[PDB]
């Protein structure tokens, strides 16, 4: 049996997401104290971001950049920091260096996007730009997503030190020397890493259709797809449960998120 048409049932949420407050801020944070922000309960248009000519790096990893307007996401974040030119290639899984080992480390099962642009005309002073720093010495490596704002004195020698600076005891931070005539490669690039996880609240702007039953069509209830015959259901969901599975471990009963009702999925 062949399907007939498609059905989409997203929630009834209308407002837009605070993406201007992450991308268009007046000045970001330095990389050793990277900023972080939760995004929830909003409608996220990723098309308007992807189809700008501004971004000179856009590498989504678990999800492809084209089909971002269709899925639904849980635990969206957004992380803003400032790094050099030849260090954008380290914001990735399984890279090694100084930005990826002492400052900001991405895990291996990563599912997000990595955006960058060139901001030489916004972050660079004619003297010395002493207000973006990065950690240079640390004893060990980092976890995934672990910050370390601690300006305690380091010890590279066998002899101990104290709160003084001397021979073989160093101050752990360091500044970039951003300069409006640095070559392309030492200029300030400006990074935002999105990360999400695949009970959802924030997702894309697909216009909601209306429910048809009792025949073989397509269906999309909160990013979950398939084809099947949406009957009327008898299952008794306690009000925190939404999906529903059998021993064959496929989706067979779904709550319609617009009008709260339990439906069954019998395969065509």
């Amino acid at each position, epitope marked *: 049996v062949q399907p007939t048409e498609s059905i989409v049932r997203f929630p009834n949420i209308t407002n837009l997401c605070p993406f201007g407050e992450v991308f268009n801020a007046t000045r*970001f944070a*330095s990389v050793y104290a990277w*900023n972080r922000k939760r995004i929830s309960n909003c409608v996220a248009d990723y098309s308007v971001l992807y189809n700008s000519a501004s971004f000179s790096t856009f590498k989504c990893y678990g999800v492809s950049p084209t089909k971002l307007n269709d899925l639904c996401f849980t635990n969206v974040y957004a992380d803003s920091f400032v790094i050099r030119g030849d260090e954008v290639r380290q914001i990735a899984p399984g890279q090694t260096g100084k930005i990826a080992d002492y400052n900001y480390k991405l895990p291996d099962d990563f599912t997000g996007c990595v955006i960058a642009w060139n901001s030489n005309n916004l972050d660079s002073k004619v003297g010395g730009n002493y*207000n973006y720093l990065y950690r240079l010495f640390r004893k060990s490596n980092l976890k995934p997503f672990e910050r370390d704002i601690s*300006t305690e004195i380091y010890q590279a020698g066998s002899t101990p030190c104290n*709160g003084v600076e001397g021979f073989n005891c160093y101050f752990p931070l360091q*500044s970039y020397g951003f300069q409006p005539t640095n070559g392309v490669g030492y200029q300030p690039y400006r990074v935002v890493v999105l990360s999400f996880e695949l009970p959802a609240t924030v997702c894309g702007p697909k216009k909601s259709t209306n429910l048809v039953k009792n025949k073989c069509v397509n269906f999309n209830f909160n990013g979950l797809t398939g084809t099947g015959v949406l009957t009327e259901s008898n299952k008794k969901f306690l009000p925190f449960q939404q999906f529903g599975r059998d021993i064959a471990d496929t989706t067979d009963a779904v709550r319609d998120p617009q009008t709260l009702e339990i439906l069954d999925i019998t395969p065509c």
Partner: antibody
Amino acid sequence: QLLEESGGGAVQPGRSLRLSCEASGFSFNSYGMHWVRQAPGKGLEWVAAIWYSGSDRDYADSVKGRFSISRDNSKNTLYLQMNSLRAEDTAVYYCARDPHCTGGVCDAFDLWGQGTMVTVSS
Amino acid sequence: LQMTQSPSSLSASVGDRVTITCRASQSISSYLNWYQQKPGKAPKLLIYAASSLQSGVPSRFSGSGSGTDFTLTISSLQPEDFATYYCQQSYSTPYTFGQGTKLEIKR
């Protein structure tokens, strides 16, 4: 948290004085530190600055080659060493702190100090 | 660099708008800070990076502009807002201040 300045009040022309600034209640070594003066009834004016490395520092157009700023991250103090004073180096001197970018304020010195009058006359 | 601040004198009544102008002499960026000095005490920070309010300052003050033209604007005065207003550039060393706009009470 506050920034208190000690330091002298009266010298002859052509001598030396050594000011101080004793910060208390925050992390001293993670900020930059500046000196700003004020001739009596006139506008503000920028004098010196010292940063993280201990060998990077700046001075004005006039006083460069006469003053010498240095810090000491253990006693939480900031020093200024004036040498060969002129007539018109008389003012009230302030110490101020400018943070570095972690999301909040950046390079606008926000916390200030008391002020110690310096009189240079015969 | 050489920053030029005007008007030098001002007199307003309680409940008006005031426009202070501080033009630079070569272009910088969003690097400009605004200070307030009540006579006798230390100065105090209001607007940093040419447009952002500093936490503690009310949302009555608001500055704007970039490039070479910068402007501070109070919406409707209070009796506690009468001082001298300074504008500072953060771009090149030395950091030069302005001249000041002394803000008076009218009767």
